[PDB]
Amino acid sequence: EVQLLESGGGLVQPGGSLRLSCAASGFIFSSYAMSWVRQAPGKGLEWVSAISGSGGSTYYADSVKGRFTISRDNSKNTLYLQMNSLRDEDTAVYYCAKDRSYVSSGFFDDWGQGTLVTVSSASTKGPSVFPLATAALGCLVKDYFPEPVTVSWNSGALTSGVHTFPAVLQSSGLYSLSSVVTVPSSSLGTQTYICNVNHKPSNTKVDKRVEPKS
Amino acid sequence: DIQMTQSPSSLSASVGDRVTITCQASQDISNYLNWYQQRPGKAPKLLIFEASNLETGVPSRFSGSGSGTDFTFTISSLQPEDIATYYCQQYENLLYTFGQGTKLEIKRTVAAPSVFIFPPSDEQLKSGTASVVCLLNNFYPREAKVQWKVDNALQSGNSQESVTEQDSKDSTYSLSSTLTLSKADYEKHKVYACEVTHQGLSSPVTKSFNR
Amino acid sequence: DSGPIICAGPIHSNKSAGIPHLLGYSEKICQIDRLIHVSSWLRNHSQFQGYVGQRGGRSQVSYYPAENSYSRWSGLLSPCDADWLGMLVVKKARESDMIVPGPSYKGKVFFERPTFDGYVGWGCGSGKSRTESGELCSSDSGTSSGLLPSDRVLWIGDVACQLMTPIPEETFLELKSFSQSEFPDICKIDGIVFNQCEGESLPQPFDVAWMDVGHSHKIIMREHKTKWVQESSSKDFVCYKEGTGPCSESEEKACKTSGSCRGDMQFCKVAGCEHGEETSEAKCRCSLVHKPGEVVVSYGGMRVRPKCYGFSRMMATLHHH
Ligand SMILES: *[C@@H]1O[C@H](CO)[C@@H](O[C@@H]2O[C@H](CO)[C@@H](O[C@@H]3O[C@H](CO)[C@@H](O)[C@H](O)[C@@H]3O)[C@H](O)[C@H]2NC(C)=O)[C@H](O)[C@H]1NC(C)=O
Ligand SMILES: *[C@@H]1O[C@H](CO)[C@@H](O[C@@H]2O[C@H](CO)[C@@H](O)[C@H](O)[C@H]2NC(C)=O)[C@H](O)[C@H]1NC(C)=O
């Protein structure tokens, strides 16, 4: 019932600005304080900012004070984070969280799915999606930037046995991952297998087919 | 202002064992401490609040205690779905601070990896780069090394490995080792071998192809 | 702003948590610092879930008039505080009880007013707060958490309550008649006969100095003298553990009767202390409560130690001319 949906993350160069949004549903938004908590890649949790139910009290961590602003629209039931003067230490997944009180209290009872903000001067590039031949198969998502990419199999109809590897950073400065799946080897002909590779930061959407060959 | 420290930073235990995590604050926070569990790929989840209270729906094997500066989070009997990193958090002060986290590994029986090898696609070969992918599927422990071989010559410094997070039911790992060559270097040689040695195999495995 | 007596403002984790009936004096004081008593009052008389005073505590309560002398002394007791200590009762309001003009009632969940014959509180239920006039509770989209800030509590008047020295009936009747002589124009205060008129005006706001001497009704005054006297009774001291919080009933009794605990300058003079022993550990320490002392009031050739004293707004009907 309670759900939080973040949006607005993406590539931004140093000194740039971004506005994050967090759409709330399933509860009386105006009765509860909200918080933003971030997590740099491979690191821990860092509380960023909080706001009372009405918006009359705001709070910020010293790492972001004066550069970030937190606000809310209680008719639209969405929470905002305006981030200016962005730096590399701001690169992180940003979560919104529902608190337990009108007053900011620190109980992070419900979390959004997170949205990624990457701070770099480098440029976007869509990925290349090559195939990979009980037997296993998969797709090779090569040479993209920035993160993330989401790989589906047969429009989500295939879930068992799927392993989508963490991306690796290449010497070229671009990312490359693989997604694989094991199928019971009587799948040649008897089944069709398609990997759905999405790279929203470049709008690249690809549906590759994987098949035996000769 | 208030700094939080967690120990251990990392921890390995097997299913059914008892797990204890400690968290300390630089000042008194009475019992104003929360504990969060962050499973691989998911947002953090509040397990205990006010240092001892179970959140709704949280299994009774989770518990916590402490007041003042020293606190404890306990899993009485480990289960495979507990694979996560655990964070403590003070809320005595409005400027909330987290501990650095404790990563919990699940020990289990040794499992040999299922090993596969994939040649470069033809569609990729026309861009002038060849990527050869070797896959290790559902093995434990994580420790395992892949040794590429081209005409029985040990490839060095031209591969990269990626490992998945521990599975929430299997407790296994999966590994990928991508060998990247040039198309000119790729079509100079015939035999491309992926040799896996791992504790769950009496003898090393080799999965190779002829192009 | 003031500060707490022993316990810092609460951070409640559950609006459905029960309020424990505590026996220790410092235990009760701790509940008073955290507005546990107003929340208990709200749950009882108004069917309200949760607490008021989240993170703010008693020190962040709002007052009418806003600039409040006795607010600055954390140890002086409001009518609500004395009610929790069982010294008096703040009754639930009835339709007849006149809501006074002047306070900013909007968004308030509880407000309290000393009346001529007692002390009266007005509450609101879950999800609602008071309208601009205070007459009604209306839906408040910011209150549904049940964990509300302190300024939702309004205490009307500049009031101090304390342990009274009981006075005989002859003293009260003489004090009664002197007040009638000082206010010949008044007929009724808060709907209660003050003089006999037949010729009254409509109810009218009335800012008056008064005192509770534990009889039928209060005693209002124009010219009076107030003096604060120090008494160094055990009720003037609160006992806490460092880390644990307020001491239990038995630990507090031991400290105040056996000179076995630690304390500040004043406590060791009164009940006695002991140093040179404290290892790492943590035992109970007792410190003086921040107040001017007990108020003693001269009025009409007499001098009393009253239960309560202060300057607050009541409603009065005057003589028609
Ligand atoms: C709101 O209602 C509750 C429920 O009645 C009130 O709590 C009650 O307060 C009375 C008076 O302090 C307590 O009485 C005492 O009971 C003990 C029994 O353990 C007895 O030893 C004493 O002699 C005394 O009679 C009573 O225990 C307590 N009840 C509960 C359940 O806590 C509360 O005072 C009301 N709040 C307000 C602001 O009116
Ligand atoms: C908040 O307090 C209420 C009141 O005690 C808790 O409700 C009880 O929860 C237990 C545990 O599931 C049940 O066995 C009781 O039947 C519940 N009683 C009532 C009256 O609801 C509630 O669980 C507490 N919330 C949290 C998060 O601890």
Cβ-based neighbours of C95, under 8 Å, separated by 6 or more: none
Round to whole Å and give the CA distance between C269 and A91: 60
Q: Are residues A16 and A113 in the same domain?
A: yes
Ligand 2 pocket check for C19: Cβ under 6 Å: no
Strand order, beta sheet including A194-199: A150-153, A194-199, A204-209
Q: Are residues A30 and A62 in the same domain?
A: yes
Alpha helical stretches, state H, B27-154:
122-125
How many C-beta atoms lie closer than 10 Å to residue C36's C-beta?
Answer: 24
Q: How far is CA B43 from CA A28, B36, B62, B86, B87, in A?
A: 22, 10, 19, 12, 12
Domain-ending residue, one of A90, A119, A148:
A119
Degrees, nearest 5: CA angle B190-B191-B195: 160
Q: Are residues A45 and A136 in the same domain?
A: no
Round to whole Å and give the CA distance between A162 and A173: 27
Please state the three-class secondary structure of chain A as a single string: CCEEEEECCCEECCCCCEEEEEEEECCCHHHCCEEEEEECCCCCCEEEEEECCCCCCEEECCCCCCCEEEEEECCCCEEEEEECCCCHHHCEEEEEEECCCCCCCCCCCEECCCEEEEECCCCCECCEEEEECCEEEEEEEEEEECCCCEEEEHHHCCCCCEEECCCEECCCCCEEEEEEEEECCCCCCCCCCEEEEEEHHHCEEEEEECCCCC
Chains within contact range of chain A (3+ C-beta pairs < 8 Å): B, C
Residue A103 falls within a domain, yes or no? yes
Cβ-based neighbours of B110, under 8 Å, separated by 6 or more: B140, B141, B199, B200
Burial (CB < 10 A; 0-12, 13-18, 19+), residue B171, is: buried
What is the residue type of A1? E
* Token pair for B149: 């071989």
Degrees, nearest 5: CA angle C92-C95-C99: 80
Are B24 and B115 in contact by the 8 Å Cβ rule? The answer is no
CA distance to partner chain B, nearest, from residue C10 (Å): 10
Domain-ending residue, one of A119, A153, A183:
A119
Which DSSP state fits B122? H
Cβ-based neighbours of C19, under 8 Å, separated by 6 or more: C31, C36, C39, C40, C43
Give all domains of chain B, ordered by start, each with its CATH number: 4-107 (2.60.40.10), 114-210 (2.60.40.10)
Round to whole Å and give the CA distance between B123 and B146: 26
Cβ-based neighbours of B73, under 8 Å, separated by 6 or more: B20, B21, B22, B23, B35, B47, B48, B62, B63, B64, B86, B88
Backbone angles phi, psi at A41, to 5 degrees: -55, 125
Ligand nearest to the CA of B57: 2
User: Of C5, C183, C13, C139, nearest to C84 (Cα)?
Assistant: C5
* Token pair for C171: 């003293």
Degrees, nearest 5: CA angle B174-B179-B180: 135
- Tell me if the bond preceding B8 is cis, omega within 30° of 0: yes
How many C-beta atoms lie closer than 10 Å to residue C265's C-beta?
Answer: 9
Cβ-based neighbours of C143, under 8 Å, separated by 6 or more: A31, A102, C109, C126, C127, C128, C129, C152
Round to whole Å and give the CA distance between A179 and C205: 78
Are A74 and A30 in contact by the 8 Å Cβ rule? The answer is yes
Closest-CA residue, ligand 1 atom 31, reads C21
Report which secondary-structure segment, H or E, holds B183.
Answer: helix B183-186
Which DSSP state fits B158? S
Are C267 and C258 in contact by the 8 Å Cβ rule? The answer is no
Round to whole Å and give the CA distance between A148 and B85: 21
Specify the number of domains making up chain A: 2
For residue B7, what are the β-bridge partners? B22
Are A73 and A14 in contact by the 8 Å Cβ rule? The answer is no
Q: How far is CA A203 from CA A125, A126, A144, A150, C265, in A?
A: 10, 8, 12, 12, 73
User: Of B151, B46, B149, nearest to B89 (Cα)?
Assistant: B46
What is the residue type of C148? L
Decide if C11 and B91 are in contact by the 8 Å CB cutoff.
Answer: yes
Round to whole Å and give the CA distance between A148 and C316: 73
Cβ-based neighbours of C6, under 8 Å, separated by 6 or more: C26, C29, C30, C33, C238, C240, C245, C246
Are B23 and B73 in contact by the 8 Å Cβ rule? The answer is yes
Backbone angles phi, psi at A85, to 5 degrees: 55, 45
Cβ-based neighbours of C174, under 8 Å, separated by 6 or more: C300, C302
3-state secondary structure of B185: helix
For residue B162, what are the β-bridge partners? B176
Are A111 and A188 in contact by the 8 Å Cβ rule? The answer is no
Q: How far is CA B60 from CA B16, B104, C46, in A?
A: 14, 18, 36
Report which secondary-structure segment, H or E, holds B184.
Answer: helix B183-186
Are A214 and A164 in contact by the 8 Å Cβ rule? The answer is no
Cβ-based neighbours of C54, under 8 Å, separated by 6 or more: A101, A102, A103, A105, C9, C10, C11, C12, C147, C148, C149, C150
3-state secondary structure of B107: strand
Of how many residues is chain B composed?
A: 211
Round to whole Å and give the CA distance between A203 and A163: 23
- Residue labelled with tokens 């550990």: C281
* Token pair for B69: 């500066």
For residue A79, what are the β-bridge partners? A22, A72
Alpha carbon B51 to its chain centroid, in Å, reads 27
- Chain C CB contacts of B68 below 8 Å: 243
Q: CATH no. for residue A137?
A: 2.60.40.10
User: Of B24, B27, B22, B25, nearest to B7 (Cα)?
Assistant: B22
Round to whole Å and give the CA distance between A152 and A155: 6
Nearest residue of C to residue A100 by CA position? C145
Find the CB nearest A31 among C55, C141, C149.
C141
Q: Are residues A15 and A107 in the same domain?
A: yes
How many C-beta atoms lie closer than 10 Å to residue B153's C-beta?
Answer: 11
Round to whole Å and give the CA distance between C95 and B162: 74
* Token pair for B173: 């790992």
User: What is the b/e burial string over C82-116, where b = at least 16 CB atoms within 10 angstroms of the residue's CB?
Assistant: bbbbebbebeebeeebbbbeebebebbbbbbbbbb
For residue C130, what are the β-bridge partners? C137
Method: X-ray
Are A39 and A95 in contact by the 8 Å Cβ rule? The answer is yes
Domain-ending residue, one of A91, A119, A147:
A119
Please state the three-class secondary structure of chain C as a single string: CCCCCCCCCCCCCCCCCCCCCCCCHHHHHHHHHCCHHHHHHHHHHHCCCCEECCCCCHHHCEEECCCCCHHHCCCCECHHHHHHCCCCCEEECCCCCCCCCCCCCCCCCEEEEEECCEEEEEECCCCEEECCCCCCEEECCCCCCCEECHHHEEEECEEEECCCCCCCHHHHHHHHHHHHHHCCCEEEECCEECCCCCCECCCEEEEEEEEECCCCCCEEECCCEEEEECCCCHHHEEEEECCCEECCHHHHHHHHHHCCCEECHHHHHHCCCCCCCCCCCCCEEEEECCCCCEEEEEECCEEECCCEEEEEEEEEEEECC
Report which secondary-structure segment, H or E, holds B9.
Answer: none
Round to whole Å and give the CA distance between A140 and A128: 8
Q: Are residues A114 and A132 in the same domain?
A: no
User: What is the b/e burial string over A26-40, where b = at least 16 CB atoms within 10 angstroms of the residue's CB?
Assistant: ebbbbbbbbbbbbbe
Cβ-Cβ contacts under 8 Å between B and C: the total is 14
Determine the angle formed by the axes of helices C25-33 and C36-46, rounding to 10 degrees. 80
Q: Does C96 touch chain B (CB under 8 A)?
A: no
* Token pair for C310: 């202060």
What is the residue type of A139? C
Q: Are residues A199 and A155 in the same domain?
A: yes
Q: Are residues A113 and A8 in the same domain?
A: yes
- Residue labelled with tokens 């009254």: C200
Nearest residue of B to residue C8 by CA position? B92
- Chain A CB contacts of B38 below 8 Å: 45
Round to whole Å and give the CA distance between A120 and A173: 11
Round to whole Å and give the CA distance between B154 and B148: 6
Pocket of ligand 2, candidates B45, B56, B62: which has the most ligand atoms within 8 Å of its Cβ, to mutate?
B56
Residue A214 falls within a domain, yes or no? no
Q: Are residues A71 and A152 in the same domain?
A: no
Q: Are residues A111 and A141 in the same domain?
A: no
Domain range enclosing A112? 3-119
CA distance to partner chain A, nearest, from residue B115 (Å): 9
Cβ-based neighbours of C233, under 8 Å, separated by 6 or more: none
Burial (CB < 10 A; 0-12, 13-18, 19+), residue B122, is: exposed
Q: Are residues A9 and A113 in the same domain?
A: yes
Q: Are residues A157 and A86 in the same domain?
A: no
Are C256 and C248 in contact by the 8 Å Cβ rule? The answer is no
User: Of A61, A127, A119, A58, nearest to A88 (Cα)?
Assistant: A119
Round to whole Å and give the CA distance between B110 and B99: 32
Determine the angle formed by the axes of helices C25-33 and C249-258, rounding to 10 degrees. 120
When computed from its CA atoms, the radius of gyration of chain C, rounded to whole angstroms, is 21
Q: Are residues A76 and A23 in the same domain?
A: yes
Cβ-based neighbours of B87, under 8 Å, separated by 6 or more: A44, A45, B6, B35, B36, B38, B44, B98, B99, B101, B102
Find the CB nearest A105 among B44, B91, B178.
B91
